[PDB]
């Protein structure tokens, strides 16, 4: 068998966000000018 | 068998974010000018 | 004056979590045995 | 004056969580045994 | 004046988490035995 | 058998972010001029 | 004036986490035995 | 058998980010001019 | 004036974590025995 | 059998980032001119 | 074993107040003008 | 073993106050003008 | 073993206050003008 | 005329005790032996 | 006229005790032996 | 006229105690032997 | 073994305050103008 | 006129105690032997 | 073994304050103008 | 007129104690033998 604990389980303060799951891609081109 | 604990489990303060999971790719070309 | 862009603004995929803000402290003593 | 953009504004996919704000503390002692 | 860009702005894939902000302290003594 | 503890488990303050997982690639060409 | 770009801005893959900010201290004494 | 502890487990302050995992490649050509 | 680029900006793969900022101290005495 | 402790486990302050894992390659040609 | 006496036990006149216990924080900005 | 006496025990006149315990932080910016 | 007496125990007149314990930090910027 | 503010007025956290007022005296001879 | 502010007024954290007022005297002879 | 601010007013953390006021005297002869 | 007496124990008049304990840091920038 | 600021006003961390005021005297003869 | 007496123990008049303990740091930039 | 700032005002960390005020005298003859 196999046994686990993953993530931030039993953490004292989970204040930051958690990672998501992307099964795919992302096309990105920010456009910043000033 | 196999047994584990992973991540930030039982951490005193999980303030930073957690890594996500990308199964794919990302095309990127930032465009910055001033 | 002063002008900025901070964080993961305009990111192509913000999949990981973001850092929080603690103004204080955290007392911690994990107790693990097997 | 001062002008800003913060956070994950204009992000292509905000999938991970965002950091919170604690003005205080957290006492923690996980208790794990097996 | 002063002008900036900080963080992982315009990144192609922000998959890892971001650093938080602690204004304080953390007392820690992990207890591990097996 | 095999037994482990990985990551920042039982850390006193996980303030920095955690590494994600990319199973793929990233094409990148920043464009900066001023 | 002064002008900057800091952090992992415009990075092709920010997979590792980012450094946080502690304004304080951390007391630590891991206790490991087997 | 085999037994381990890896990463920054039981660290007093994990403020820096953690290394991710890329199973692939990255094509990169920064373009900077001023 | 003064102008800069710092950090791992425009890097092809920021897989390792980034250094944090401690304005303070850390008391440490690991206790390992087997 | 075999038994280990690796990484920055039980460190007093893990402020710097941690090395990632690339199973692949990186093509790079920075382009800087001023 | 361990044995103690703490506080102002057996004092001849406990006229001043005693210190409390805050497990948290306090945000403060007095506003005084005349 | 270990044995102690702490504080102002057996004092002839505890007229001043006693130190408290903050496990956290305090943000402060007095604002005084006249 | 170890044996102690600490603080202002058995003092003839504890008129001044006693030091507290902060496990954390304090951000401060007094603002005084006239 | 005369105008004042005294004590810990407008304090962000009055956790320690306050000094009392003795108009008199205190005779004291602690007797400790072990 | 005359105008004042005294004590720990507007302090961010008054954790230590405050001085009292004795108008008199204190006779003291601690007796410690072991 | 005359105008003042005294003590630890507007301090960021008054953790130590404050001086009292004795209008009188103190006779003292500690007796320590072991 | 080890044996001690610390602090202002058995003092004839503890009129001044006592040092506290900060396990952390303090950011400070007084702002005074007239 | 005359205008002042005295003491540890606006200090970033008043951790040590403050001087008291004795208007009188103190007779002292410690007696230590071992 | 080892045996001690430290601090201002058995002092005839502890009127000045006592040194505290900072395990950390302090950032400071007073701003005074007139 | 006359204008001043005295003491450790606006100090970044007042950790040591402050001088008191004795208007009188002190008779002293420590007696130490071993």
Curated annotation (Swiss-Prot), chains A, B, C, D, E, F, G, H, I, J, K, L, M, N, O, P, Q, R, S, T:
Tissues with expression: Highly expressed in the brain, lung, kidney and heart. Expressed at low levels in the liver and spleen.
Localization (cell): Cell membrane; Golgi apparatus
Post-translational modification: N-glycosylated.
Gene ablation phenotype (knockout): No visible phenotype. Mice develop chronic demyelinating polyneuropathy after 60 weeks. Mice show abnormally low iron levels throughout the body, and are mildly anemic. Iron accumulates in duodenum enterocytes, suggesting impaired transport from the intestine to the blood. Mice deficient for both Prnd and Prnp have the same phenotype as mice lacking Prnd; they are born at the expected Mendelian rate and appear grossly normal and healthy. Females are fertile, but males deficient for both Prnd and Prnp are sterile, in spite of normal mating behavior.
Family of the protein in this entry: Belongs to the prion family.
Purpose of the protein: Its primary physiological function is unclear. May play a role in neuronal development and synaptic plasticity. May be required for neuronal myelin sheath maintenance. May promote myelin homeostasis through acting as an agonist for ADGRG6 receptor. May play a role in iron uptake and iron homeostasis. Soluble oligomers are toxic to cultured neuroblastoma cells and induce apoptosis (in vitro). Association with GPC1 (via its heparan sulfate chains) targets PRNP to lipid rafts. Also provides Cu(2+) or Zn(2+) for the ascorbate-mediated GPC1 deaminase degradation of its heparan sulfate side chains.
Domain text: The normal, monomeric form has a mainly alpha-helical structure. The disease-associated, protease-resistant form forms amyloid fibrils containing a cross-beta spine, formed by a steric zipper of superposed beta-strands. Disease mutations may favor intermolecular contacts via short beta strands, and may thereby trigger oligomerization.
Assembly with partners or alone: Monomer and homodimer. Has a tendency to aggregate into amyloid fibrils containing a cross-beta spine, formed by a steric zipper of superposed beta-strands. Soluble oligomers may represent an intermediate stage on the path to fibril formation. Copper binding may promote oligomerization. Interacts with GRB2, APP, ERI3/PRNPIP and SYN1. Mislocalized cytosolically exposed PrP interacts with MGRN1; this interaction alters MGRN1 subcellular location and causes lysosomal enlargement. Interacts with APP. Interacts with KIAA1191. Interacts with ADGRG6.
Disease per record: Found in high quantity in the brain of humans and animals infected with degenerative neurological diseases such as kuru, Creutzfeldt-Jakob disease (CJD), Gerstmann-Straussler syndrome (GSS), scrapie, bovine spongiform encephalopathy (BSE), transmissible mink encephalopathy (TME), etc.
Protein name: Major prion protein
Organism: Mus musculus
Shown stretch of the complete protein: 107 to 140 of 254
């Amino acid at each position: 068998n196999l046994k686990h604990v993953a993530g931030a389980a039993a953490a004292g303060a989970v204040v930051g966000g958690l990672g998501g799951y992307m099964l795919g891609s992302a096309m990105s081109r920010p456009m910043i000018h000033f």
